[PDB]
Ligand binder design. Structure first.
Ligand SMILES: *C(C)CC(=O)c1ccc2cc(OC)ccc2c1
Length: 248
C-alpha cells in the first residue's frame, strides 16, 4: 500500500494480516453496476444501503444484520456490508449470513489491500469490492482490479480528489465511487465532491456517497449524472427512510 498515518495506517496494516477464509460460493455473481444502470433505465432511484455497526466517525448501532438486509432487499439497488473489524466491528460471518439471505448485489466494504481479501469476498458470496485510490499504489490498484475481474467482479474504484480521478481513469475504472469524506481526516467536502463528479466521463457508472441532507442531494446530484447513492448512518439509524428517499 501507500505510506499512511493515523487510524488509516493502522487499519491497512491490520488488513494485510487478515486471515483468509475457505468456503464455496453458492450463487453466481450478481452485478451491482449492471443493476444500477437497469434502475436508471426504469427511473428508479438507486440507493446502496450499508450495514455498518461502528465507524471511526462515531457511528455506533447494534441491530440485526439479517432483518436489516431482508428489509433492504425490497428497496436498495444493492447492499454494502462492512467487514472491517477494528473500527467498524464488522465480520466475515456477518457477510456470509447476509449474502445467503438476499438475492440483490452485495459489496464487501473493507480495506482491500491483498488478493486473499478478494478471494474472501468471492468465497463469502459478495459480488464486488471497493478499491480505494488513497491507500493503494497505482500498481496495486491496476493488479487488484485485474484480479477481481478474473472472478467476474467489477470493483468500484473510490476517489476523493482530482488526482484520484486521474489514476482511476488511467487504470481503466468503469465503476467509480465519489467519496465526500476524506479517509484520513474524516472531513466532508460536498463542493469538491460535486466538482469531481462533473469531471467523470458519462460512460462511467458513478456512485456518490450521500448522508447529511439526502433527498435534496439525490435530486441535485442525479442531474449532474450520478447513477446511484451510497448511504450509511441515516439508514443504520432509521432503515425505513430508504422508502421516502426512493418514492415520496
Ligand atoms: C463506496 C460505495 C465504497 C464503499 O461502499 C465503502 C463504504 C464504507 C467503507 C468503510 C470502511 O471502513 C471500515 C472501509 C471501506 C468502505 C467502503
Amino acid at each position: 500500500p501507500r505510506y499512511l498515518k493515523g487510524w488509516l495506517e493502522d487499519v491497512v496494516q491490520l488488513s494485510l494480516r487478515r486471515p483468509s477464509v475457505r468456503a464455496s460460493r453458492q450463487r453466481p455473481i450478481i452485478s451491482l453496476n449492471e443493476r444500477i444502470l437497469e434502475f436508471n433505465k426504469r427511473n428508479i432511484t438507486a440507493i446502496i444501503a450499508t450495514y455498518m455497526r461502528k465507524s471511526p466517525w462515531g457511528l455506533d448501532v447494534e441491530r440485526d444484520p439479517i432483518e436489516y438486509a431482508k428489509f433492504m432487499e425490497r428497496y436498495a439497488v444493492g447492499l454494502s456490508i462492512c467487514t472491517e473489524e477494528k473500527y467498524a466491528n464488522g465480520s466475515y460471518e456477518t457477510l456470509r449470513k447476509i449474502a445467503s439471505s438476499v438475492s440483490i448485489p452485495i459489496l464487501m466494504a473493507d480495506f482491500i489491500v491483498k488478493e486473499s481479501q478478494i478471494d474472501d469476498a468471492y468465497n463469502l458470496g459478495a459480488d464486488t469490492v471497493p478499491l480505494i485510490v488513497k491507500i493503494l499504489t497505482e500498481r496495486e490498484l491496476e493488479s487488484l482490479l485485474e484480479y477481481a475481474r478474473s472472478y467476474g467482479m467489477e470493483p468500484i474504484i473510490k476517489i476523493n480528489d482530482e488526482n484520484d480521478l486521474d489514476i482511476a481513469l488511467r487504470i481503466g475504472a468503469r465503476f467509480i465511487g465519489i467519496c465526500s469524506r476524506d479517509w484520513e481526516t474524516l472531513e466532508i467536502n460536498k463542493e469538491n465532491q460535486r466538482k469531481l463528479i462533473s469531471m467523470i466521463p458519462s460512460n462511467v457508472v458513478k456512485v456518490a456517497s450521500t448522508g447529511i441532507s439526502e433527498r435534496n442531494e439525490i435530486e441535485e446530484l442525479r442531474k449532474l449524472g450520478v447513477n446511484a447513492f451510497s448511504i450509511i448512518s441515516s439508514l443504520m439509524r432509521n432503515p425505513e427512510k430508504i422508502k421516502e428517499l426512493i418514492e415520496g
